[PDB]
Amino acid sequence: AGARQALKRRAVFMKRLNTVHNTAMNLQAQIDSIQTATSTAETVKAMELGTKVV
């Protein structure tokens, strides 16, 4: 019975671990979105400059 108790508690801890890891991955996705938007803005600015010259 105590083994089953400990395994249930462990199951709760691993579920919390999974939720935390997924939240950290979502934050990484947001960071990547910020950096991608910055790079895309610089690319569009360079293309507009070249288009003006041509």
Partner: protein, 55 residues
């Protein structure tokens, strides 16, 4: 006789009834606060199958 009139048997019945009622209320209050459904909270939808296989 003076003592028996002071602490009558009806008085002792009232006191013991109050003790019984209050003991029941303390038991109900202190078992309400100890319901395992909280710390358990989320229960297995598979109904212990995963914990069965873990054991």
């Amino acid at each position: 006789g003076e003592k028996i009139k002071t602490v009558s048997p009806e008085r002792t019945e009232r006191v013991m009834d109050s003790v019984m009622e209050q003991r029941d209320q303390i038991e109900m209050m202190t078992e309400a606060l100890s319901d395992p459904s909280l710390s358990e909270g989320i229960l297995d939808f598979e109904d212990d199958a995963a914990i069965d296989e873990q054991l």
